[PDB]
Amino acid sequence: GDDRELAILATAENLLEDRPLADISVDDLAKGAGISRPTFYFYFPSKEAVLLTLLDRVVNQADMALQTLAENPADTDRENMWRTGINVFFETFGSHKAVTRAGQAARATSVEVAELWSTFMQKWIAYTAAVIDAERDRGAAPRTLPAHELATALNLMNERTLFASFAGEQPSVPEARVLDTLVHIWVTSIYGE
Amino acid sequence: GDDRELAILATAENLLEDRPLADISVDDLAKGAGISRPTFYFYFPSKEAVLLTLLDRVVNQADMALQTLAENPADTDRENMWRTGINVFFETFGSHKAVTRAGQAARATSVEVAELWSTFMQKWIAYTAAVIDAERDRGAAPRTLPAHELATALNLMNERTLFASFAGEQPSVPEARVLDTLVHIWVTSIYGE
């Protein structure tokens, strides 16, 4: 049943908080989920497919929250609008730091994980660019850089900066400061002449 | 002699243009350098030490060029000053795309490579922050974000964006557009109120 599959995923996420995926065996996942190794292979072909599934759930959680925001504009200024949107990624991925860090490392080694991340980044960049274009059309932002190129760089900044903060990398922006830092750069670069 | 060592490094850089380091054997490096496998081990303990040495030369090339710029201000406006500096990284790493891509992937697997990159990033962020602080002290830039946090995010943006462009990743900014894109974001976020 789905319960055994969910047990595997819950075990994987918890074990990923203490060691990398290269330090997790299929027997570890089976044992923590209360199943045998052959039973595990009925639900997943590999431990990498387990991570892929975990990462897919996290990215779709962030995507669905962003869609929710897009359909219900909040009644605030332009700065808070961008902050509320960037915060979706801050909170969703910040609530799944182990899966986030694991998925970032797997991008090099897994074509499926690299394609998953690329597909969602393309979608989020396209939406960012559409909002910038709307702001220009209504006269609220100046026509400076091509909107899509600007949106690409800003989203890549968020990816790199958020993930450095969550991993505690050196250098990084402190996690308590990263939202204000990113919002400042987005707002000045989108609305500055 | 150094000639054999330089032959190994030249062979490694050329072979890294067609396949990753995990597809390069020590016998490949020895053969292309005109030496035997035991002779190779006299100069390097592993193929990863060869990449580490290649990456060290590239990062020191960029660092030394930036130092040169810092000691000889160019007589231009503020925008061109930032552009000339960002261009150091664009041109140095863009001239060594295979070593750059290899070194980025090795950051996950090599503590020495991760420490090398972290040390130089900290240095470049500190210098960026010092320039921002000077611009504020002279009244040319507003006192908005903490200069060091702003400098951290902007340098992480450049790292991620430049390397996506050089690797041809999807999404990325076209290489012919990435300098203008980065300069716009730096200048608006440093001087915008």
Ligand SMILES: Nc1ccccc1Nc1ccc2c(c1)OCO2
């Ligand atoms: N302005 C706005 C309007 C409606 C929904 C979200 C936003 N902000 C937003 C959007 C997409 C984003 C992002 C922020 O950061 C990454 O992608």
Ligand SMILES: Nc1ccccc1Nc1ccc2c(c1)OCO2
């Ligand atoms: N304004 C300025 C003055 C003197 C030298 C360089 C710059 N620009 C600069 C500096 C450091 C950088 C950078 C640009 O990008 C990465 O690190």
